[PDB]
Design a protein around this motif. Structure first.
Motif, short mmCIF file in Angstrom:
data_model
loop_
_atom_site.label_atom_id
_atom_site.label_comp_id
_atom_site.label_asym_id
_atom_site.label_seq_id
_atom_site.Cartn_x
_atom_site.Cartn_y
_atom_site.Cartn_z
N UNK A 1 96.29 137.84 82.61
CA UNK A 1 96.21 136.48 83.17
C UNK A 1 94.91 136.23 83.93
N UNK A 2 93.79 136.66 83.35
CA UNK A 2 92.50 136.56 84.01
C UNK A 2 91.91 135.15 83.90
N UNK B 1 83.69 136.89 78.74
CA UNK B 1 84.86 137.73 78.93
C UNK B 1 84.49 139.20 78.85
N UNK B 2 83.82 139.60 77.77
CA UNK B 2 83.46 141.01 77.63
C UNK B 2 82.64 141.47 78.83
N UNK C 1 88.46 140.35 89.96
CA UNK C 1 88.30 138.96 89.51
C UNK C 1 88.92 137.96 90.47
N UNK C 2 88.64 136.68 90.20
CA UNK C 2 89.14 135.60 91.04
C UNK C 2 90.66 135.55 91.03
N UNK C 3 91.27 135.68 89.86
CA UNK C 3 92.71 135.85 89.75
C UNK C 3 93.01 136.51 88.41
N UNK C 4 94.20 137.08 88.30
CA UNK C 4 94.45 138.06 87.25
C UNK C 4 93.96 139.42 87.70
N UNK C 5 94.07 140.40 86.81
CA UNK C 5 93.64 141.74 87.17
C UNK C 5 93.28 142.54 85.93
N UNK D 1 92.74 150.29 88.43
CA UNK D 1 92.56 148.86 88.65
C UNK D 1 91.25 148.63 89.38
N UNK D 2 90.45 147.68 88.89
CA UNK D 2 89.10 147.48 89.39
C UNK D 2 89.04 147.07 90.85
#
Ligand code: SF4
Lengths: 611, 325, 274, 527
Positions: free
Chosen positions: A353-354, A402-403, A412-416, A423-424
């Motif tokens: 869900x990025x 995306x890549x 990221x702003x949202x998602x993961x 996990x980053x």
């Protein structure tokens, strides 16, 4: 009398060295209503042969032979006499739309001038009406409004549509189309083919179209000429050619074209080496350095294009051995899809869900934001171990960003984002730098991705040196990597500028492979390479997957390569993933409209299915 | 159009309003005007020192001093020279003399330079290109003070050879025109030839090189080939489609071109004896005069920044990528 | 390396001009101790004589030899040119680099400050400070003053160079394979930008000599009894009309130096730029 | 071109009959500074060029001939006469018809008012020179309406010098109230009585124009107007090659060859009594206040090579001036230079004895370096003197620093105030040589810009003026001169060669040397 007849045309350019003989004595004919295709890879001389007939070569070019248009000879005329034929009889469509229109005139004005300069009585207030009507005929929406637009207000598709209209203005007796659909997406390309077909229908003209692919040729053309080393080496009707190509070169050039009807893992048939330099050729057939059937008899004198079957000619002396045989047979390549190993079901990358946005703002000195371009919209995607994921979409669809967001390995702003169970967001620099050892990337541009003034050994060693391996061992690593990607030991000292495009991309692959990663991100690796070279690199990527157990993120605009490489596919529309699943399902049974349309737009090199 | 121009007018106002401040501080630190007084031999009685320090404002710190200076300059009172004459009486006449030189120099210079550069780029590596590029190199390599004197020597020798005073080069006008207006203008034109030619050569040699580069970049674009493919002749395509597009880069460089000509005019005004702003700059620096130099830096900044706004209007009118998006 | 010197050595005009410039620079120092009369030695028997058997280039109104005077003028005026060009290129490099690196507000403040500094022509700003650098023996202050107002347009080119390269791909690839930032700097940017910073120096030499000699001509630069080519031309011009050599020799030497510098600049630029 | 550059007994003008000359036209002439004041009796307006304008405009008592002899100007005065020697007294007589431009009769009161102003009796008038108006015991009217009787309590052989030669007569209006004298003439002169009068001024283009006086009672001039323009050095000869400059002086070999080779121009030669010099500031606060240092510096300047450089090709065998009071070619001339004859080794010994030790390139005392500021008008002719002096002083270790300044306000803003340590300028004298003594060299003299002197010089000066026999007076003046040299007052360098370039059509105009111009006679030769 033939609409166009060319006899023994030859072209040479001059430089600090020997003069490069770009075209070496070709001849052909075009009839009213007929479409003739000139097919060939880069360096083959097609474009010079076009601009020689139109008469717009650079001033440093010499031209010989004969070019006759409707019975009047064109070579040697002064421009005051030639420009009575340009536009009025010969209309031309050029390759790159980004530069093709002058930036300081509105497009309606640029078409109106085209009609005005051969119909000087017409008057501006009638020419502008005709210009709007032509923008309508070429399919630009809201034509009377867009007629006021300047070129920078147009997309690449719109720009190329405007050049087709500057050309069908008047009603040119002959259409000359110089690679008219490169740098355009597959859907726009299908529409441009529709527009050009319609133009031929309304004018009644003949068409000479110049391409480097067999898909457009199978779809659009009636006859085909295949150019190699500045000469025509085979010619036939497109049905006859595809089904019965009697010439080793075409055997290859038509076996290295990727196909949607093939299954994953199918190896292509490449052609080794690279084209000859057209300054000072060797005696005999120019294809002898690459010909798999080469015999010393073919090195005593250059073969001549000779009659083989009804309306079919080929410039080879050993064609009797080519009849009916597959490309795999003649080149001795085992094309079969080898058994895939049982890689584990574990997931090496997962994105959930990025989301990301690029702001749209207006004003140069100070900026006012007026909207949000949702470049990445809640995408969910994943990659299993030991497999390929193919991400496909057209320009501006957000696949690339995306890549490269995944590779930056930051929250990221949202998602993961998860990589190898990590996990980053729980990743400080000590861990982030160690995780970079496990995934690296291959870029689309071999001119930009390699340091211009660093030798091959230094380039391929750079990941190893920076990661702290010793001078005693890194030498062995480089010597092994050059072997793995198929380059010679003895190329390490050479600087990048001394290589071909294919070789430079092989260097990039070696560099990315340097730490033995488990994921490689392939950012449009094989675009803008000749098709026969693309086939070799595709085989290399497949073979390395079976040799080492690698996993790939593959992102591209074309779908024909993706059918061969990808086990899973995700298709992106304007930042949204709109289909995802197994490749055989996505390509065999699409259910989203956009996906079905995108698959329908792909040019297919088989002419027999023209229903 | 009238959004880009407004936003760049506010920028130029701020640039000038800070240029004046910072060059007044530079002037007021670099100059020590009372040195002559303090070095007179029967050393001046302090009363005189304090009185003249007050009359010039030296008793106030820099910030207050500049506040007072602007408070009067905006009212048109630019203060007094070190000798006690008002600065305002000279300033109008000086500005007139200087602008009449700069305008003719720049107009003729840039027009000639643009034509020469375009011709060179069109005829690349032909003999005319070779000759004009080396001539531009020569003219760009001779300093302005060498050019002026070479032309003066040359005129002198002409006058001697032809036997009459054909060229005039001292001052801006001769004493008397003997009635009539047509002649009152004619004599000024005769005087203006050599001074303005000295600047026109420098401007032309700069702009020919700049325009040659820009035009060669335009010849690398595809749209010339597109234009000819419609049926245009080679020269109509080059002019109507190429040269108009090549002119746009030149509109951005004209501000710096004028900045160069403002410097050249110092030497030209001194050598040919014109009583303008450039000669006044040398006089003012030589006498340590704060007020003369303050007036002159404001003029020299304003003329360069107005070149900028004229160039901004022309770049919007020529190029649509700033007119519409 | 080999390719760039092959490109330059084929450019016959540029290699010839560089040779001539170096031979002038060497001669300005190597030759004077061999001559029969030095600068600041006056022969009162030979005022304003033309070239001959004892004064190789004749004398000026004071009885000074003109050959020796010009060798001294070349010394001073070419040393200031080289030093100013080097220091000016250094300042331009650092300002342009930091701006083109950071981007954002820091770049938009540093380029706006450069834009402000260009508001009043550089020569005026130099000439306003010149009463403080006048009447001191050390040329250091004049070199500092000329360099401090010459770096501004070069800063813009450097800003470009950096901004373009900071988003080039070989730079990208690096970060993705663990190279430390100091290794990126000594490994990539220095080898790739040095070749153009050298063009900056080569082009700035001519402008530096022009600035110094103009300032000297107005009487603001180098003060007697020292000399500069600007000083010599200013001294000779009031005599040129009657006796020409006292203006033509110093002036021809100055124009030749500037032509050689510009030829070297253009040719070297064409050797690097493909 | 070449001659001796000593005062002679001829002149070089195109002497012609005024009647035969062209009946109109104008004469154009140069200036170096737009006059800051027009009262030539005041230091601000006592300049050679300001006076050069005034020549055509104000009365004089006597006419000076080419050898320096005198005669009464019958156009203004009937018979000036020395009435008695012992209680010395003389009578002037203005012509029975004589009026100022405003209508006022020229009267004994105008002689008296001018005498009162330049008497020095009241300090409110900041006069340029006291002359002998300080010797006149009284001035009164005689029997006639205009008869003026002047009585001297103390002898004055230069009594012809009042209102004559370089001196003039001004209206009583502008010489009676101190206010009128100092501030009444900053913009244009007051009343006038000469054949010409100034009728247009232009501070905008820096020009001035005279026109004939329609009230003039003398000979009707052969010119209508005279036009003056303000120019710098390089505007004098190149503009002379043009119709711009009608006539200009010639200062260097460059200027001489330009004027010789151009067409329509002729070179005119008659050496005048003018000369050029360094003057030293010996006033409180100036580094040269100590006479020992002034003598030490003087021994280190070679005036002979200065002469040979400066007058190269303008004189056959050029030599320096070695006398203050009389110039070469005047009677009574002598060489008094010995005390400061060039000898740099004894000057090194003296600078050692005065404690200016050698340190670095130059010399120092108490950490202060020996630097001398030199002030001069910026012109090609003046720079040569400066550069030679700088070069020969560098050899003894003294830095001499050049301050080249333009002509505007030069005297007023620098010389008059005393903003120098050494200054270059020249004196333009006339046929009355002892008239310079109390003006320049006396310790309270009005023109003693360096403030140098001592009682011995003043006593010798007075003793020289208090005598009635020139034969011995000249010898006493030479004693005064020797004392002026022994003081280290100033250094004479060269005597003016008298070379002037003029347009060949001009007549009764050129280089006059000792002689006066007849301002009615100048004109243009008919084509
Ligand atoms: S002619 Fe011979 S060498 Fe040439 S392509 Fe055919 S088989 Fe190969």
């Amino acid at each position: 009398s033939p609409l166009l007849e060319v006899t023994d045309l030859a072209v040479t350019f001059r430089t600090d060295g020997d003069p490069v003989t770009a075209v070496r004595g070709i001849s052909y004919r075009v009839e009213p209503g007929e479409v003739v295709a000139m097919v060939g890879e880069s360096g083959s001389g097609k474009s010079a042969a076009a601009m020689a007939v139109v008469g717009l070569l650079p001033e440093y070019a010499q031209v010989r032979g004969s070019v006759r248009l409707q019975g009047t000879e064109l070579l040697g005329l002064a421009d005051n006499a030639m420009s009575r034929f340009r536009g009025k009889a010969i209309g031309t469509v050029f390759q790159d739309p980004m530069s093709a229109l002058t930036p300081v005139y509105t497009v309606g004005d640029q078409i109106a001038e085209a009609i005005e300069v051969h119909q000087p009585r017409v008057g501006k207030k009638a020419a502008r009406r005709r210009a709007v009507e032509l923008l309508d005929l070429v399919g630009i929406s809201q034509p009377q409004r867009r007629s006021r637009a300047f070129p920078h207000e147009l997309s690449g598709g719109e720009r190329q549509r405007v050049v087709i209209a500057i050309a069908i203005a008047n009603d040119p007796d002959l259409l000359i189309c110089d690679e008219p659909t490169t740098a355009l997406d597959v859907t726009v390309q299908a529409q441009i083919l529709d527009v050009l077909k319609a133009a031929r229908d309304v004018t009644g003209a003949g068409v000479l179209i110049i391409t480097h692919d067999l898909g457009v040729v199978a779809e659009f053309a009636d006859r085909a000429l295949v150019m190699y080393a500045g000469r025509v080496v085979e010619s036939a009707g497109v049905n006859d050619l595809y089904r019965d190509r009697r010439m080793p070169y075409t055997v290859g050039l038509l076996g290295s074209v990727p196909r949607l009807d093939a299954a994953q893992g199918t190896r292509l048939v490449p052609i080794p080496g690279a084209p000859p330099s057209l300054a000072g050729l060797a005696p005999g057939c120019p294809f002898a350095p690459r010909c798999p059937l080469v015999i010393d008899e073919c090195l005593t004198a250059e073969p001549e294009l000779l009659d083989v079957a009804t309306d079919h000619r080929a410039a080879c002396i050993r064609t009797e051995l080519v009849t009916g045989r597959s490309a795999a047979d003649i080149y001795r390549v085992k094309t079969e899809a080898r058994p895939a190993a049982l890689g584990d079901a574990s997931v090496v990358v997962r994105v959930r869900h990025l989301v990301k946005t690029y702001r749209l703002a207006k004003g140069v000195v100070l900026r006012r934001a007026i909207g949000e371009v949702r470049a990445v919209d809640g995408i969910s995607l994943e990659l299993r171990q030991g497999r390929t994921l193919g991400i496909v979409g057209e320009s501006g669809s957000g696949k690339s960003t995306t890549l490269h967001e995944i590779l930056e390995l930051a929250a990221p702003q949202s998602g993961s984002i998860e990589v190898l169970g990590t996990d980053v967001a729980t990743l400080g620099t000590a861990e982030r730098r160690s995780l970079r050892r496990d995934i690296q990337v291959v870029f689309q541009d071999p001119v930009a991705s390699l340091d211009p003034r660093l030798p091959v050994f230094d380039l391929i060693a750079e990941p190893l040196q920076a990661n702290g391996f010793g001078k005693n061992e890194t030498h062995a690593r480089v010597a092994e990597l050059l072997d793995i990607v198929g380059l010679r030991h003895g190329d390490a000292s050479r600087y990048p500028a001394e290589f071909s495009g294919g070789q430079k991309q092989r260097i990039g692959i070696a560099r990315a492979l340097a730490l033995q990663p488990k994921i490689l991100a392939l950012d449009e690796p094989v675009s803008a390479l000749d098709v026969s070279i693309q086939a070799g690199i595709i085989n290399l990527l497949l073979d390395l997957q079976e040799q080492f157990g690698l996993s790939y993120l593959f992102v591209s605009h074309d779908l024909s390569v993706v059918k061969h490489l990808a086990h899973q596919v995700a298709v992106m529309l304007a930042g949204t993933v709109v289909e995802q699943g197994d490749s055989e399902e996505v390509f065999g049974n699409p259910k989203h409209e956009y996906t079905r349309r995108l698959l329908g737009a792909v040019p297919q090199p088989d002419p027999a299915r023209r229903g | 159009m009238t959004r880009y121009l407004a936003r760049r007018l506010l920028n130029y106002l701020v640039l000038l309003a800070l240029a004046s401040f910072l060059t007044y501080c530079l002037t007021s630190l670099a100059f020590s005007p009372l040195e002559s007084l303090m070095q007179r031999s029967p050393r001046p009685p302090q009363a005189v020192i304090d009185a003249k320090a007050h009359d010039l404002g030296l008793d106030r710190p820099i910030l207050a001093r500049y506040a007072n200076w602007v408070s009067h300059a905006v009212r048109g009172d630019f203060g007094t020279t070190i000798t006690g004459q008002p600065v305002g009486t000279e300033l109008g006449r000086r500005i007139g003399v200087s602008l009449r030189l700069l305008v003719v120099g720049s107009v003729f210079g840039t027009v000639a330079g643009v034509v020469i550069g375009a011709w060179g780029a069109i005829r690349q590596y032909r003999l005319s290109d070779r000759v004009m590029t080396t001539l531009a190199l020569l003219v760009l390599s001779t300093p302005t003070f060498v050019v002026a004197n070479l032309l003066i020597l040359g005129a002198l020798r002409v006058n001697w050879a032809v036997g009459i005073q054909l060229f005039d080069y001292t001052g801006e006008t001769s004493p008397g025109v003997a009635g009539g207006v047509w002649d009152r203008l004619g004599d000024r034109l005769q005087h203006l030839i050599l001074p303005s030619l000295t600047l026109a050569l420098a401007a032309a040699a700069g702009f020919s090189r700049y325009q040659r580069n820009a035009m060669l970049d335009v010849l690398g674009q595809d749209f010339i080939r597109t234009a000819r493919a419609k049926g245009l002749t080679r020269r109509r395509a080059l002019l109507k489609h190429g040269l108009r597009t090549a002119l746009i880069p030149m509109a951005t460089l004209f501000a710096y071109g004028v900045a160069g000509l403002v410097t050249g005019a110092v030497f030209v005004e001194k050598i040919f004896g014109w009583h303008g702003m450039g000669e006044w700059m040398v006089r003012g620096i030589s006498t340590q005069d704060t007020n003369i130099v303050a007036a002159i830096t404001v003029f020299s900044g304003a003329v360069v920044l107005l070149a900028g706004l004229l160039s901004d209007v022309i770049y919007a009118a020529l190029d649509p990528r700033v007119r519409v998006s | 390396r080999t390719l760039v010197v092959r490109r330059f050595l084929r450019n016959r005009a540029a290699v010839a001009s560089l040779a001539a410039l170096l031979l002038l620079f060497v001669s300005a120092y190597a030759l004077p101790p061999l001559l029969p009369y030095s600068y600041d030695d006056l022969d009162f028997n030979a005022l304003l004589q033309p070239p001959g058997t004892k004064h190789w280039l004749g004398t000026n109104a004071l009885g000074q030899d003109l050959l020796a005077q010009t060798l001294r003028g070349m010394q001073k005026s070419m040393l200031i040119g080289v030093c100013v060009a080097v220091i000016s290129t250094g300042i331009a490099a650092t300002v342009g680099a930091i701006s083109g690196y950071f981007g954002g507000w820091r770049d938009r403040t540093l380029m706006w400050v450069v834009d402000l500094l260009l508001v009043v022509p550089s020569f005026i700003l130099i000439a306003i400070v010149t009463p403080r650098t006048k009447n001191s023996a050390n040329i250091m202050f004049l070199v500092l003053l000329l360099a401090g107002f010459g770096w501004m347009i070069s800063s813009r080119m450097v800003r470009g160079m950096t901004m373009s390269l900071r988003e080039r791909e070989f730079i990208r690839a690096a970060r993705y394979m663990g190279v430390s930032s100091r290794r990126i700097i000594v490994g990539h940017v220095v080898p790739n930008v040095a070749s153009i910073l050298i063009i900056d120096a080569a082009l700035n030499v001519a402008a530096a000599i022009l600035a110094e000699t103009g300032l000297s001509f107005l009487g603001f630069g180098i003060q007697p009894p020292d000399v500069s080519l600007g000083t010599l031309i200013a001294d000779g011009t009031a005599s040129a009309t009657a006796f020409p050599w006292v203006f033509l020799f110093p002036a021809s030497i100055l124009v030749l130096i500037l032509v050689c510098a510009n030829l070297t600049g253009d040719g070297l630029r064409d050797a690097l730029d493909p | 071109a070449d001659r001796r550059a000593a005062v002679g007994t001829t002149s070089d003008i195109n002497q012609q009959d005024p009647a035969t000359l062209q009946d109109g036209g104008n004469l154009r002439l140069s200036l170096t500074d737009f006059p800051p004041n027009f009262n030539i009796l005041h230091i601000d307006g006592n300049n050679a060029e300001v006076a050069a304008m005034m020549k055509a405009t104000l009365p004089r008592a006597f006419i000076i001939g080419p050898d320096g002899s005198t005669t009464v100007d019958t156009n203004y005065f009937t018979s000036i006469e020395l009435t008695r020697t012992a209680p010395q007294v003389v009578t002037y007589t203005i012509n029975p018809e004589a009026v100022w431009s405003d209508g006022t009769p020229i009267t004994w009161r105008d002689i008296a008012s001018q005498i009162h102003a330049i008497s020095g009796a009241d300090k409110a008038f900041e006069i340029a020179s006291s002359s002998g108006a300080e010797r006149v015991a009284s001035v009164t009217r005689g029997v006639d309406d205009r008869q003026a009787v002047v009585t001297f309590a103390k002898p004055y052989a230069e009594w012809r010098g009042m209102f004559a030669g370089n001196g003039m007569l001004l209206p009583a209006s502008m010489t009676a109230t101190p206010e009128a004298f100092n501030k009444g003439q900053l913009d244009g002169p007051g009343p006038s009585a000469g054949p010409f009068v100034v009728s247009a001024l232009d501070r905008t283009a820096q020009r001035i124009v005279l026109t004939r006086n329609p009230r003039w009672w003398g000979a009707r001039p052969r010119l209508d107007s005279i036009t003056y323009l303000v120019l710098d050095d390089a505007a004098r000869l190149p503009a002379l090659q043009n119709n711009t400059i009608d006539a200009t002086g010639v200062g260097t070999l460059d200027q001489l060859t330009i004027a010789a080779r151009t067409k329509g121009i002729s070179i005119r030669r008659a050496p005048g009594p003018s000369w050029y010099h360094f003057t030293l500031n010996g006033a409180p606060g100036s580094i040269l206040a100590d006479k020992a240092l002034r003598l030490a510096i003087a021994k280190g300047i070679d005036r002979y090579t200065i002469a040979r450089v400066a007058q190269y090709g303008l004189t056959s065998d050029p030599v320096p001036l070695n006398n203050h009071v009389f110039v070469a070619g005047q009677d009574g001339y002598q060489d008094n230079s010995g005390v400061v004859a060039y000898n740099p080794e004894q000057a090194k010994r003296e600078l050692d004895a005065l404690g200016w030790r050698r340190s670095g390139a130059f010399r120092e005392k108490d950490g202060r370096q020996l630097v001398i500021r030199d002030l001069f008008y910026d012109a090609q002719s003046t720079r040569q003197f400066a550069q030679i002096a700088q070069h020969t002083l560098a050899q003894i270790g003294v830095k001499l620093e050049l301050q080249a300044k333009s002509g505007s306000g030069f005297f007023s803003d620098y010389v008059n105030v005393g903003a120098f340590d050494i200054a270059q300028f020249g004196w333009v004298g006339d046929a009355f040589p002892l008239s310079s003594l109390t003006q320049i060299y006396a310790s309270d003299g009005e023109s003693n810009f360096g403030k140098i002197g001592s009682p011995q010089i003043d006593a010798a000066i007075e003793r020289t003026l208090a005598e009635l026999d020139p034969g011995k007076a000249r010898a006493l003046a030479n004693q005064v001169d020797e004392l002026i040299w022994a003081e280290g007052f100033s250094l004479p360098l060269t005597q003016s060669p008298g070379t002037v370039a003029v347009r060949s059509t001009l007549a009764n105009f050129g280089a006059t040397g000792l002689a006066d111009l007849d301002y009615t006679a100048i004109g243009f030769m008919r084509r």
